[PDB]
């Protein structure tokens, strides 16, 4: 049921093949000290802006999303904590309820 | 004289840290086992593809350049030991010279 040309399954592995061979070069090239000129021969230089901006774009989407999961949860907290203390208050013994009080001036 | 606006260079100046910053992660990730999935992150299937390719572009060329040497070389060399033959043919004695004649047949 793969249903696939013969013609479109070597293609495949070609592509496949071709990129597999390039992350490998690309290792050698970091163990050899040579990833820099290799950069520069395979990426164009607005290739080459376009990835280091993107990386910029990642670290404010990261930055901005955590940022936002922190005041979602501060703002949880601050409210979960409240009902926290009202809970233990009520808990408390009378003893020291009505001190409080007397220290509630 | 460098004659530069200071918005120009401190554009280059971002460019170029975001850039190292880039190859400078990469590195990371290969030595983290992350490589992979980083690339897929980084690049489009586009530009994967054509990463792909280009690594065989540069092998056919690297290939057709260095065949176009080997037979300039193997053709100039057929041509220099003729005439170093012939140069040592001369310089041979009688006897071996009249030696090879009669073997000559
Ligand atoms: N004894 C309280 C302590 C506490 C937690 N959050 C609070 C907020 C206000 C006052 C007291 C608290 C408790 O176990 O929950
Ligand atoms: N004695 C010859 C050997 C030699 C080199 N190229 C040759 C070609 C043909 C015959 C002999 C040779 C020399 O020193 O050069």
Redesign the interface.
């Not at 990835?51 to 910029?56: A, E, M, S």
């Given at each position: 049921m793969a249903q696939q040309s013969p013609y479109s399954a070597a293609m495949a592995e070609q592509?496949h093949?071709?990129?597999l061979?390039?992350?490998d070069?690309?290792?050698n090239a970091?163990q050899n000290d040579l990833?820099?000129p290799l950069?520069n021969?395979?990426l164009t230089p607005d290739?080459?802006?376009a990835?280091?901006?993107?990386?910029?774009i990642?670290e404010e989407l990261l930055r901005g999303e955590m940022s936002q999961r922190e005041l979602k949860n501060e703002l949880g907290a601050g409210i979960a904590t409240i009902t926290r203390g009202s809970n233990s208050l009520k808990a408390a013994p009378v003893e020291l309820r009505q001190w409080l009080e007397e220290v509630l001036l």
């Open positions: 592509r093949q071709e990129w061979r390039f992350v070069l690309l290792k970091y990833h820099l950069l021969l395979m290739e080459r802006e990835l280091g901006t993107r990386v910029r990642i």
